[PDB]
Design an enzyme around this catalytic site. Structure first.
Site, PDB file in Angstrom:
ATOM      1  N   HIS A  67       1.089   3.557  -2.379  1.00  0.00           N
ATOM      2  CA  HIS A  67       0.150   4.636  -2.658  1.00  0.00           C
ATOM      3  C   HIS A  67       0.813   5.953  -2.980  1.00  0.00           C
ATOM      4  O   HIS A  67       0.523   6.965  -2.360  1.00  0.00           O
ATOM      5  CB  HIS A  67      -0.776   4.813  -1.481  1.00  0.00           C
ATOM      6  CG  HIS A  67      -1.896   3.826  -1.450  1.00  0.00           C
ATOM      7  ND1 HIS A  67      -2.773   3.646  -2.500  1.00  0.00           N
ATOM      8  CD2 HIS A  67      -2.299   2.980  -0.476  1.00  0.00           C
ATOM      9  CE1 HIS A  67      -3.678   2.729  -2.155  1.00  0.00           C
ATOM     10  NE2 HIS A  67      -3.394   2.304  -0.944  1.00  0.00           N
ATOM     11  N   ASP A  74      -1.104  -1.976  -4.354  1.00  0.00           N
ATOM     12  CA  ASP A  74      -1.668  -0.631  -4.141  1.00  0.00           C
ATOM     13  C   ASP A  74      -0.511   0.349  -4.128  1.00  0.00           C
ATOM     14  O   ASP A  74      -0.240   1.076  -3.155  1.00  0.00           O
ATOM     15  CB  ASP A  74      -2.496  -0.532  -2.877  1.00  0.00           C
ATOM     16  CG  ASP A  74      -3.974  -0.778  -3.098  1.00  0.00           C
ATOM     17  OD1 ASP A  74      -4.446  -1.199  -4.210  1.00  0.00           O
ATOM     18  OD2 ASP A  74      -4.760  -0.508  -2.179  1.00  0.00           O
ATOM     19  N   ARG A  97     -10.083  15.560   3.931  1.00  0.00           N
ATOM     20  CA  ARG A  97      -8.700  15.346   4.369  1.00  0.00           C
ATOM     21  C   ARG A  97      -7.854  16.616   4.536  1.00  0.00           C
ATOM     22  O   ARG A  97      -6.697  16.570   4.997  1.00  0.00           O
ATOM     23  CB  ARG A  97      -8.060  14.390   3.397  1.00  0.00           C
ATOM     24  CG  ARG A  97      -8.709  13.023   3.464  1.00  0.00           C
ATOM     25  CD  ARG A  97      -7.863  12.227   4.470  1.00  0.00           C
ATOM     26  NE  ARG A  97      -8.592  11.733   5.520  1.00  0.00           N
ATOM     27  CZ  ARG A  97      -8.094  11.137   6.593  1.00  0.00           C
ATOM     28  NH1 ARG A  97      -6.810  10.968   6.841  1.00  0.00           N
ATOM     29  NH2 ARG A  97      -8.972  10.690   7.427  1.00  0.00           N
ATOM     30  N   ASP A 104      -7.459   1.745 -10.774  1.00  0.00           N
ATOM     31  CA  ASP A 104      -7.955   3.100 -10.744  1.00  0.00           C
ATOM     32  C   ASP A 104      -7.782   3.707 -12.120  1.00  0.00           C
ATOM     33  O   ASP A 104      -8.358   4.759 -12.403  1.00  0.00           O
ATOM     34  CB  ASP A 104      -7.142   3.999  -9.781  1.00  0.00           C
ATOM     35  CG  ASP A 104      -7.471   3.807  -8.343  1.00  0.00           C
ATOM     36  OD1 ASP A 104      -8.352   2.980  -8.027  1.00  0.00           O
ATOM     37  OD2 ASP A 104      -6.881   4.460  -7.417  1.00  0.00           O
ATOM     38  N   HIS A 121      -3.297  -8.929  -1.905  1.00  0.00           N
ATOM     39  CA  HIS A 121      -3.950  -7.705  -1.558  1.00  0.00           C
ATOM     40  C   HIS A 121      -5.377  -8.040  -1.169  1.00  0.00           C
ATOM     41  O   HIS A 121      -6.309  -7.903  -1.987  1.00  0.00           O
ATOM     42  CB  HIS A 121      -3.917  -6.781  -2.728  1.00  0.00           C
ATOM     43  CG  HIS A 121      -4.237  -5.374  -2.379  1.00  0.00           C
ATOM     44  ND1 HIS A 121      -3.257  -4.435  -2.218  1.00  0.00           N
ATOM     45  CD2 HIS A 121      -5.397  -4.786  -1.969  1.00  0.00           C
ATOM     46  CE1 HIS A 121      -3.814  -3.290  -1.839  1.00  0.00           C
ATOM     47  NE2 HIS A 121      -5.110  -3.464  -1.698  1.00  0.00           N
ATOM     48  N   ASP A 134       0.802  -1.210   0.000  1.00  0.00           N
ATOM     49  CA  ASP A 134       0.000   0.000   0.000  1.00  0.00           C
ATOM     50  C   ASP A 134       0.834   1.258   0.000  1.00  0.00           C
ATOM     51  O   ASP A 134       0.614   2.204   0.759  1.00  0.00           O
ATOM     52  CB  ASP A 134      -0.952  -0.068   1.169  1.00  0.00           C
ATOM     53  CG  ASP A 134      -1.956  -1.124   0.975  1.00  0.00           C
ATOM     54  OD1 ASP A 134      -2.950  -0.840   0.277  1.00  0.00           O
ATOM     55  OD2 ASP A 134      -1.759  -2.286   1.381  1.00  0.00           O
ATOM     56  N   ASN A 137      -6.204  -3.328  -5.686  1.00  0.00           N
ATOM     57  CA  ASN A 137      -7.418  -2.767  -6.315  1.00  0.00           C
ATOM     58  C   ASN A 137      -7.179  -1.448  -6.965  1.00  0.00           C
ATOM     59  O   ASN A 137      -7.723  -1.179  -8.034  1.00  0.00           O
ATOM     60  CB  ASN A 137      -8.594  -2.691  -5.330  1.00  0.00           C
ATOM     61  CG  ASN A 137      -8.261  -1.985  -4.069  1.00  0.00           C
ATOM     62  OD1 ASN A 137      -7.511  -2.491  -3.287  1.00  0.00           O
ATOM     63  ND2 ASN A 137      -8.845  -0.765  -3.851  1.00  0.00           N
ATOM     64  N   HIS A 138      -6.288  -0.662  -6.386  1.00  0.00           N
ATOM     65  CA  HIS A 138      -5.957   0.620  -6.954  1.00  0.00           C
ATOM     66  C   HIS A 138      -5.109   0.576  -8.194  1.00  0.00           C
ATOM     67  O   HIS A 138      -4.968   1.603  -8.846  1.00  0.00           O
ATOM     68  CB  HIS A 138      -5.373   1.610  -5.913  1.00  0.00           C
ATOM     69  CG  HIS A 138      -6.387   2.103  -4.935  1.00  0.00           C
ATOM     70  ND1 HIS A 138      -7.074   3.286  -5.105  1.00  0.00           N
ATOM     71  CD2 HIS A 138      -6.870   1.550  -3.792  1.00  0.00           C
ATOM     72  CE1 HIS A 138      -7.900   3.459  -4.082  1.00  0.00           C
ATOM     73  NE2 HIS A 138      -7.803   2.416  -3.276  1.00  0.00           N
ATOM     74  N   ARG A 185     -15.302  16.381  11.638  1.00  0.00           N
ATOM     75  CA  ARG A 185     -15.837  15.299  12.438  1.00  0.00           C
ATOM     76  C   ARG A 185     -16.737  15.721  13.603  1.00  0.00           C
ATOM     77  O   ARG A 185     -17.065  14.877  14.418  1.00  0.00           O
ATOM     78  CB  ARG A 185     -14.718  14.415  12.973  1.00  0.00           C
ATOM     79  CG  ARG A 185     -13.804  13.937  11.899  1.00  0.00           C
ATOM     80  CD  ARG A 185     -12.679  13.076  12.379  1.00  0.00           C
ATOM     81  NE  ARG A 185     -11.815  12.737  11.262  1.00  0.00           N
ATOM     82  CZ  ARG A 185     -11.119  11.624  11.117  1.00  0.00           C
ATOM     83  NH1 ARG A 185     -11.182  10.648  12.023  1.00  0.00           N
ATOM     84  NH2 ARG A 185     -10.346  11.474  10.048  1.00  0.00           N
TER      85      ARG A 185
END
Ligand SMILES: [Mn+2]
Ligand SMILES: [Mn+2]
Length: 525
Positions: A18, A59, A385, A95, A192, A16, A91-92, A354
């Protein structure tokens, strides 16, 4: 292999990543430091007569705009230089269109593996299911697997001719294949799929623990994992540590004779499993998660704040800096360009999004309704974010707000379903990521029940159809939101959250925040 001889093999792993090719704003991680650490391990291991295999749980795509803009070219090329041997497709990696993934296979000098992904039309695999390595006299196979949740979370237009077999069932078949044909001494799965305590995957597809329990005992030396994004460090049997701290002991999980590891995310750690192999037996001698220049905020007596390393500094490898610098510099300059402006601060700070409704929630959700034709909308405050300050808005601004590549979705539902849905979502509490941001919704929630429920200022009619926008994350049960992906009125558009926000700003600029200002339309008391 030689009978009764004991062989030293160390497995190094990350997942991951990323898009974190470069160090962060505090000098943490990045691939240049990763490279120094890894080279060092290789030297140490070679001096003792051992071998190293380095694996990723996938990822690599999506998460840092300088990377995303360049289709993770810097990341894959950096991984070549760190010397990755294989990776599981995440999974990414979906994308982007498949053709982009194919060029990532081109850039990568190691195989991107996935056994369980098939072209429907031909019943043939799209990728290499496994790869073989020779380490000393040992033949080692690595199988790749990908969560079948990929087809549920990504863009459905990418998957019209693709199916994901359940990876646990694929794994049984491939292990048996290998045992009958190539006959490796060791099999490792790079996956993954996700680590869930005691196999309690909930709304997620079954992952690593459930797979290990279903395979023949000890058939894999280990599962190098990803996707859940956890440091797999066990506090007790079948329970990971909560809030694992860098620079502390990490006991990996072990299920049905099979070790399961994961190294959190973003290049924050290199995991290191030191094994001894003798006559087919694999024994783990040491496991650790090695921090890559991770740092903690500290404050001295006189109020001076600094970020201090949890462990000794790792120098950045300069060959990596020369390879990666151009990508970083090109990217950063491109993403600073103005795409619009706002006459006020769009509030996306954690302590606000939040706890209360903010103008940033309203902006994001306006963009999502506009794209989908929705009447109202919701998302988790934890999916917002960052803030965007008053003034010029850049591509980078949008990325920081929406860095994770969530997909925009919608559902047509009756007012009766709208009542049930929002009543449930309205019970999510402040001081959690799950805290809902709404658009075009008003009510007063009292005693867990919604009073004066209106959409667009009109009372809800149980017979009328309403379109709701949200993210793929919430629609499929993220943050415990009610599932929408089984409703007949559900559509996954495949449009990416940051693209939608960016285009909305472009066509709406200059933004007047007065339009996006919450005025107590929803309240709890
Ligand atoms: Mn991930
Ligand atoms: Mn994932």
């Amino acid at each position: 292999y030689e009978q009764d001889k004991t062989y030293k093999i160390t497995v190094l792993h990350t997942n991951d990543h990323h898009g974190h090719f470069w160090r962060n704003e505090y000098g943490e991680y990045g691939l240049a430091a990763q490279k120094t650490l890894v080279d060092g391990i290789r030297k140490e291991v070679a001096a003792e007569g051992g071998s190293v295999l380095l694996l990723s749980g996938g990822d690599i795509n999506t998460g840092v705009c300088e990377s995303d803009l360049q289709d993770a070219e810097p990341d894959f090329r950096g991984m070549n230089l760190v010397g990755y041997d294989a990776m599981a497709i995440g999974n990414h990696e979906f994308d982007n269109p498949l053709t982009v993934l194919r060029q990532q296979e081109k850039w990568a000098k190691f195989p991107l593996l996935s056994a369980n992904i098939y072209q429907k039309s031909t019943g043939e695999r799209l990728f290499k299911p496994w790869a073989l390595f020779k380490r000393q006299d040992l033949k080692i196979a690595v199988i790749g697997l990908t969560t079948d949740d990929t087809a549920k979370i990504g863009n459905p237009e990418y998957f019209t001719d693709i199916e994901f077999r359940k990876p646990a069932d694929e794994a049984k078949l491939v292990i048996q294949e290998l045992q009958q044909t190539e006959k490796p001494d060791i099999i490792i799965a790079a996956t993954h799929m996700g680590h869930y305590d005691n196999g309690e995957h909930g709304s997620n597809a079954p992952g690593d623990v459930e797979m290990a329990r279903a395979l023949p005992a000890g058939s894999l030396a280990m599962i190098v994992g990803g996707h859940s994004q956890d440091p797999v460090c066990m506090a007790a049997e079948n329970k990971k540590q909560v809030d694992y701290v860098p620079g502390t002991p990490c006991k990996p999980d072990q299920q049905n004779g099979i070790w399961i590891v994961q190294a959190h995310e973003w290049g924050k750690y290199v995991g290191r499993a030191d094994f001894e192999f003798r006559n087919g037996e694999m024994k783990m001698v040491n496991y650790q998660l090695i921090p890559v220049n991770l740092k903690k905020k500290v404050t001295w007596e006189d109020g001076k704040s600094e970020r201090v390393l949890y462990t000794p500094e790792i120098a950045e490898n300069q060959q990596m800096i020369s390879l990666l610098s151009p990508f970083q510099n090109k990217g950063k300059a491109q993403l600073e360009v103005k795409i619009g402006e706002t006459n006020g601060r769009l509030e996306g700070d954690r302590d606000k999004v939040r706890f209360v409704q903010t103008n940033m929630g309203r902006l994001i959700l306006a963009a999502q309704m506009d794209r989908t034709g929705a009447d109202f909308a919701v998302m988790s405050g934890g999916g917002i974010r960052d803030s965007i300050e008053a003034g010029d808005i850049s591509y980078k601004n949008v990325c920081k707000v929406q860095p994770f590549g969530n997909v925009v979705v919608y559902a047509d539902m009756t007012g009766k379903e709208v009542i049930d849905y929002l009543t449930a979502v309205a019970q999510m509490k402040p001081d959690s990521g799950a805290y809902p941001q709404f658009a075009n919704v008003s009510f007063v929630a009292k005693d867990g029940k919604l009073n004066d429920l209106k959409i667009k200022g009109e009372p809800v009619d149980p017979a009328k159809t309403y379109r709701m926008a949200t993210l793929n994350f919430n629609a499929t049960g993220g943050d415990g939101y009610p599932r929408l992906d089984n409703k007949p009125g559900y559509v996954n558009t495949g449009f990416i959250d940051a693209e939608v926000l960016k285009a909305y700003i472009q066509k709406s600029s200059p933004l007047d925040v007065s339009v996006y200002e919450p005025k107590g339309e929803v309240s709890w008391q």
